[PDB]
Amino acid sequence: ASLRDIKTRINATKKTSQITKAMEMVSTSKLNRAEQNAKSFVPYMEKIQEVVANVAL
Amino acid sequence: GKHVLVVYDDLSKQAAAYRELSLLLRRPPGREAYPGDIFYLHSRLLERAAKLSDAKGGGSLTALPFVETQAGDISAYIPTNVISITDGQIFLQSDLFFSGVRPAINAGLSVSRVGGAAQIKAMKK
């Protein structure tokens, strides 16, 4: 094809790469903040389950 | 004092014919083997379209030259020369053509330096 043909597709793909990288960074920060709630939840579930371990038997 | 519309179908083919004549007459060529005075030729042709003043009768002539490119290369020599002369350009694109958009005016690239002054008030609104 032509240089004119190639340049447009290169531009589009570079913009796509930019957008994908930005979304990857955002998801990384979201995952980091998401694990905290699981950390907070574990003690509650364990403390209820240990009471169940004798109440429900 | 009348108004005339003139359409030139292939300035590219006219330029090809003039290039052939120049090379047969053995004049030195420029880039893409075209003679150096092709721009003079086309400018002398096109700049004869004008809107005359009221003292001259008020007649006018508008021109619509056509230029054909190969695989969308608008940086070529004849397209650049013709673009640098005319007041505006309209680009028709095959990718728009086959996706259903006919006519294929690409509004993003098309330019008109005489916009607004050439439209009625309702259209301008």
UniProtKB/TrEMBL annotation, chain A:
One Gene Ontology term of the molecular function aspect: ATP binding
Localization annotation: Cell membrane
GO CC terms in record: plasma membrane; proton-transporting ATP synthase complex
This protein's UniProt keywords: ATP synthesis, Cell membrane, CF(1), Hydrogen ion transport, Ion transport, Membrane, Transport
Principal location: membrane
GO terms of biological process kind: proton motive force-driven plasma membrane ATP synthesis
Function text: Produces ATP from ADP in the presence of a proton gradient across the membrane. The gamma chain is believed to be important in regulating ATPase activity and the flow of protons through the CF(0) complex.
Assembly notes: F-type ATPases have 2 components, CF(1) - the catalytic core - and CF(0) - the membrane proton channel. CF(1) has five subunits: alpha(3), beta(3), gamma(1), delta(1), epsilon(1). CF(0) has three main subunits: a, b and c.
Assigned protein family: Belongs to the ATPase gamma chain family.
Protein name per Swiss-Prot or TrEMBL: ATP synthase gamma chain
Taxonomic source organism: Bacillus sp. (strain PS3)
Name of the coding gene: uncG
Covered range of the whole protein: 2 to 58 of 285
UniProtKB/TrEMBL annotation, chain B:
Cellular location(s): Cell membrane; Membrane
Binding site for ATP 4: 84, 113
Binding site for ATP 1: 102
Binding residues annotated for ADP 2, in chain numbering: 113
Residue positions binding Mg(2+) 2: 9
Binding site for ADP 1: 112-113
Lineage top rank: taxon: Bacteria
Chain positions recorded as ATP 5 binding sites: 112-113
Sites annotated Required for activity: 110
Binding site for ATP 6: 113
Family: Belongs to the ATPase alpha/beta chains family.
Chain's role: Produces ATP from ADP in the presence of a proton gradient across the membrane. The alpha chain is a regulatory subunit.
Protein name: ATP synthase subunit alpha
Species of the source: Bacillus sp. (strain PS3)
Whole-protein coverage range: 253 to 377 of 502
